Structures are given as structure tokens and as C-alpha cells.
């Protein structure tokens, strides 16, 4: 089991990221987990000559009551990008998103049997903090491929290929894609048969010593062929006020930055003069046709917008109320690659659910996670997100307060 | 002299690509040279340093200093250059213990480690970089060169390597005495047990002997300090803690220096004295004079300072923490952006107090501020106690509900209850969801010339009114707000307003009750006086009726 050498992005040094405060419950969980990992040889205590740090958290597995350690390798991942993307890049299959069902299987346990390059171990340092700074934090580094580092599947790739070879050969129309600690397995089979194949796959994995409804933000399976447009939708009324038309024109105006063809000339003609907002304006036949044409446009996709693999994805999310959230993924603004809605607690719980759902979709569609613009105070998110987080990855995010009418225009 | 620990050394590197320091030694007075020879001879005998030859090419300057009314010489090594070239280490402490987080113990003992750094060995491979040279008289001949065998004073790695050494040394003691609490802080150990006083003193002796087996000396029973412990600006007593005495000077003339020092002391006091305020005192420092310039106290600053003296006239203490009980946090509004809080487990025996002021953003309301305060206290509690408090808040459940469900940001206050402690947090107006029948519709707009900074604000209305006011040294943003303000002034109790300013709309939709902008404050005053206000947006320059006509009105002479 010779290790694979790993270089950082030349000129970059390792991560030095502050450990965020943890509740006692989570500190105790982590101490217990890490003690067992240390015994098994997966990690080792380190001394102060290691200046590096990566935050750790504890989350709940599945719909299970067992604690799981989540390491936030976002920084290390950014600093090792030439390694896992250029050098050992896992290609992403375009057929996955076209399958009727896709099942997500956690294979993170595979990594702990593969030694980590000795010169790289230092960059995987992490700290278990104490309460009230009673004692210095407990410091460890990894001796094995760690869960959450994009390098680990990059390195484990050739092993995963051997593991999956008989299964892929016997099932040539099933698509299997690895992203970070998970496998995504898609078929066009009837669901019973699909699940029978998944159980078969599990047995193959089991033979390599990998002994792998849970979430509210997704079901047993994903159904990506189901995912279809969230059209900007225009209201339908038998009576129109000046205020209603003004609303409509504002919505159409902003719709026209995304969709070509959108016209408002005729609708604005109806607003000539300085009118009372509640005055009823009967639509002339011209305005009616303009409105009809606009509806047709909004039902169809946007000509000319394509994913660019050299560019980051961005996701924006709006709170719509009554447990509803809207979202758009783009790379250049107004050039929406995908829009949608997540529905049905508290605000922070629901938002973490939407984020996990949107990221999963994005993995399936592009093999990349978006950077989220989250409508919430930074500290509130940082305090609470781990209470509800169940994914083994963590997308990039930043915090915005982007009112007002961007919300109106998506529902 | 003293033991050097037989603990394993920490391996230490220079930063990649860099070599050790080679800084020239300056000639020294005969006096200083003689002092250093005596000092280094004794340090060498005690194993702290060793003689080396001209074979080692490294050097750091050395100096000797003896104070003017004193006979004791000291050696000073200037490790600035070695420090610049030494690797980064893990940070020593992410924070310091808050006394309110301490759990009360029957007996507490403080043990300070004597000559801490000098009792820990330095990595053998790194010692060469610590070389220094006592020069000969008038640098005629070769100097006497030495290197360190132990952690030097002022070297970058000493604090961290000392801490990790102490951590390792303590590990087996902790493993065998899980009941005993031992805080590590700098060269100190603070050691608490609930043992009877006889068995506690026995365990302290066992600890001292354990530490001695590892080359670390500590004070014996006789020399050990007794409570209350004066520690980092706190007093720690057997069943309470507080801040050390705060002296608030009486002065004819306050310097900026005096005012800065006062505010610092008041801020320190606020962690246990409830309701301390510093807002008016802080306002005085928002100038640009510095140091010894005299700032006259304003009346509001005099009133604030007087109220603080009253708060501080009699001692106040906090209690320690009991982990088997919930933490309860209460917050009150003190007015003008100031908030104060107390945290207790049994009413009303505070573990600690605090204040929150922060203006987040240009414009805000009390519901947002309260939420921010709650967030701050929540984080502080996780840090000090490892759990979140239950809150008691001066806002009705219905008010909170209306706000969060309608607001566009995700919010989540954890477990809380309304407490009727006026002033209560509320919202002071609300915008209509629908346009108002029988109300005049105003179409407002503002324009400003970027070159001249002149502008116009104005309205037209469906009842045929119009008005334009001229403005100077303004901006497009300000003119758009000026226009809304005009419409509010000139309208009756119910009014519909149509703006093309997303900026204005965003500000007003968030129901601000306070602003850094006087204009926004004037608009809020009007909004509260109205019975019904409907505010709507339209895109600019689309020939939308009403908006088109006010646009032409305010652009005249300003923009084409
Ligand atoms: N100097 C000092 C110092 C600083 C800190 Cl942060 C802690 C410290 O010792 C304590 C420890 Br260990 C544990 C609890 C407390 C709070 N005080 C007591 O429990 C206490 N009990 C008794 N008998 N005296 C004192 Cl003081 C402790 F004070 C001593
Ligand atoms: Mg305008
Ligand atoms: Mg303008
Ligand atoms: Mg305009």
C-alpha cells in the first residue's frame, strides 16, 4: 500500500482555519469518535510544530441517532485543486441526470484502509476544543485518506474501479458516479428492479469490507428526469387595476433580462397619464396579445445559455414564506442554468434542507457544488447549520440581504 | 540551579528556504561584558546553555541591562531575526477562561511553574540557530559563543512548546484523577477538587511530586497563595467572583487618554455590574484629536457617567456555574440602540451580565436588534458553558411571529418566553399589502447631477397636484428619499406612493425605526403618523404613466 504523493498549489501553504465553538454534547461525541479512530490508527495526536487547522463538527448520520464526525475541508480542498481536479480528475457522466432513478450510497468507509502520504498528513490537522478554554484543544492529524477531502476519492479511484468492474460489466446501462464520499447510481429500471440492483451493488461493496425515510430534503431515491422548469408565471385576472398592470410590467421588465422577446410596449400604453392605483383598466386586444406572447416565451427554455465547466456555479435562494423557498443556479447573472422551488420546523432548518437538496441536484447535473448566496445572518447560520446538516460535504457559501422584488418575480 | 525536564523535545524547523540568523554583535562596554560572562558561566553550570566554537556560523545579538537604582544585571537576547525565520506554531490559546464558566470547588490550589521555559529542553537539531557571542573588550579577539539547550525567553516557539510539554506531563495524572480539575494557563495550573481538605492537600502533593519527576518545580504548601485569587482583572472567591476594584477618577479636565481608559474600565465592569452604559462617553472619542487634548464632557456624557458611578458605588459579585441546571438569559432595551442582559440559573443570582449596542447596517429596528443581541449571547454561552440559554425577551410572541414570517431573511431565536418588562419591543408602522381606495396616488422621483451635485425631488398626483423642490450637494439616492418625504408631508392620513427607487423601497420595507440618515428618520416620523401607506415600485424610464411626468419634472435642468 504505497502512498500517493500530494503537492499543494505552488506558493500556497496549508489551511489555518479557526475551529468554531462547539456545544458540550458535540465535543463529547467527537472525543469518543476520535479516541476510537486513534486506537484503529486512522489519526494520531500531533504537537505544536504543526501550525495547520481545519474545523470539525459532529452531525447525525441518516435518520439515525449515531454521531458522525464531519471535517470541513473546504479550504484544504481549494488549496489541493490541481491534485484532485487536474491531475486525478474524476470525469462526470452526462447520462446520470437522464436516468429515472438515482440512489445515493455512502462509501466514505472505503477510504480508511488507504494510507495517506506522510508528507501531506500535517495539512489534515484538526482540533477538538474544550469548554471555557479549560484545557488546550486535542490536536490530531490523519494517517489515512480522510472523509471530506476531495483528494481521497481522487486517490481511491483505481480501487473503486476494480470494486465496481464486475457490476458495471453485468449492468452496462447503469451509471455509477462518485462524488466525494458518495456513489450516485442511476438506472432506467422499474423501482423494484432498481432497488434489487442497489442491494447487489451493496454486496459487491461489502466484499471489499465496506459495510454501508432518512432525510426530509430527499426521498430514498432521486428522480432527476422529473426535474423540470420552474416557469416565471404571470397572473391571470378577469379585472386589471393600474396597480396590477404596474406589477406586471415590473415583473416582465425583469423577466426580459433573462428571456429575449419579452415586450411591454402595449401594457405601458394602458398606463398613460397619472392614474389612481385602484382604477380598473380594461385590457385592449393589443395588450392581451402581448401578454399571451410573453406567456409562451416564459414556458420554454432560454436560448443560448450553456454550462461552462471552467466557471463556478452560483446559487441564490429566496424565502417566499409559508415554508416555500425559490432558487436559481447560474454562472453569469440572469443566465439561469436551473431554477426551482423547495417546499415544507424553523427558517434555519428549512434553509439547510434547501441547500442540501440544491447541492445534490447540482452534483447530479454537473458534478460540481454551487456557491450559495444565503439570505441569513452569518452568525445565525454558523451557530445552527450543523443541528440539521446531514450531508458529508459542505458547499461554499456567503451571506446576503438581497430584497425586495427578486422574490416577487420568482413566485 | 533547577531541573530541565526529561520530556521528549518537539522537532522545530526554520521556514522553508530560509537559513539561520547571522546578525553581527556590536561592541559592548567592559562592564556589560563582565556581567554577561558571569551570567553565562552560571547558566552553563545549570545546563541552560553550552559553549560552542567558531564552527557554528549563526549569531543573534546579546545585551546586558542593569537598572539605575539596582545592582542586578540581566542578559537580553534579541531574537527578532531568529523569530522571523522560525516556523509558525499552533496558537497557544483560542480564548481565556471566563470565571462565570467555572464550577465551584471545595478546594482550589494555584501552582505556578518556576522558570518555566528554562525547565524545557530545546530540540537538539535547532539549538545551533540560538547561537550568541559575548564580545571581547574592544572586539580585539574572538568572543565567547554559546547556544541554548532550553526554550529561550522571547523565542517564537517557547510558549507553544512549553504548553504542549505541560499537557503531555499532565496526561497520566489526569487519566488517574478524573475528578480533579486542572486549568492550564501560561506557566500556571489551577487545580480544583471536591475532596475533603486533607485529601486535597495530599493530591496536590502527589501532583507536585509528579511534576517534579518531570523536571517542573512548583510552590510548596507554605508558599501557595490563598483566596481570593487576583487573576487577569478578576477576583475569584470560594463561592463568588467579580472584577477587581474599578477606580473612576474625578477630574476637572478629561483628556482623550483619560476617556479611553474610563470606557475600557466601564466595559470591563459591564460583565458583572448590570446596566453599565458607555454610549455618550464613546461619542466623545469619535473625533480626531488624540492623547492629551481635553474633551469637554457633554451633558449627556455627564448624565451617563453619573449613572455609572451609582451602579458602581457598592460591590456586585457573580456566582459560579452549576452544570445540572439551565441557563436563563434576560435582555432589556435601555434606549437609543443600547441593550443590556443578565444570565442566571436561579433567579436572580447572575453568573454574568453584558451589553449589546452594535448598529448592524445603516437602518434598523428593535426586532432586528433584539435578534442580534440574542445571537451574540447565544455564541457567548456556547463558548463559556457549552450550551445555549433559555431566553426571556421583552417582545410578544405575536410581534415576533408577524416579523419573522413576513421578513425576507431567515431568522431563528431558540427557546424563549415573553417577559413583560417595558419598554416592549414592537414595530411602529406597517405598509399596506394593497393600494388604498379613496387615497391620493403620488408618483415621486428625484434626480441629481453628478458634476454639480444639484438635484430636484418631487411628485405628481392623480388629483393633479405637483411639486418640485431644489437641492444642493445631494446625490441620486438622497433625492429619491427626499421625494418620498415630500409625498408623505403633503399627503393626508392615507396615501399611495409609487417610486422607481429600489433603494428607497428596500429601506422602507424593512420597517426601520432608527437610522444613521436624518432624512430616513424624517420619513419614519411621517410613516408612524400615517394611518395607511401603500408603497409600490415601477421601473424607471419605461414611459409608465405618472412616473413619466414626475421624471420630466425633476430632470429639468439636472439630467437629459
Ligand atoms: N488565579 C487563579 C485561577 C484562575 C482560574 Cl481561571 C481558576 C482558578 O481556580 C479555580 C478552579 Br481550578 C475551579 C473553580 C474555581 C472557582 N473558585 C472556586 O471554586 C474556589 N473554591 C475555593 N475553596 N476557593 C475558590 Cl477561589 C477556581 F477559581 C484559579
Ligand atoms: Mg427615479
Ligand atoms: Mg433617481
Ligand atoms: Mg425616474
Curated annotation (Swiss-Prot), chain A:
The record gives the effect of mutating residue 85 to G as:
Confers resistance to pyrophosphate analog PFA
According to the record, mutating residue 321 to E results in:
Confers resistance to abacavir, lamivudine and zidovudine
Summarizing the annotation, the consequence of altering residue 61 to R is: Confers resistance to abacavir, adefovir, didenosine, lamivudine, stavudine, tenofir and zidovuline
According to the UniProt record, what happens if one changes residue 64 to Y? Confers multi-NRTI resistance
Consequence of changing residue 58 to V:
Confers multi-NRTI resistance
**Which residues form each disulfide bond in the chain?**
none
Q: What is the effect of changing residue 186 to S?
A: Confers resistance to efavirenz and nevirapine
Q: What happens when you mutate residue 65 to A?
A: Confers resistance to lamivudine and stavudine
Motif Tryptophan repeat motif per UniProt: ranges: 381-397
Q: What is this protein called?
A: p51 RT
State how changing residue 369 to I affects the protein, per the record: Confers resistance to abacavir, lamivudine and zidovudine
- Region RT 'primer grip': list its residue ranges: 215-223
- Could you say which residues are annotated as the site Essential for RT p66/p51 heterodimerization? 384, 397
Effect of substituting residue 271 to I: Confers resistance to delavirdine, efavirenz and nevirapine
Name the consequence of residue 85 to K: Confers resistance to pyrophosphate analog PFA
Q: Which residues bind Mg(2+) 1?
A: 106, 181-182
Phenotype for residue 102 to I: Confers resistance to HBY 097
The annotated consequence of residue 185 to I reads: Confers resistance to HBY 097
What does the UniProt record report as the effect of altering residue 65 to D in this chain? Answer: Confers resistance to lamivudine, stavudine and rarely to zalcitabine
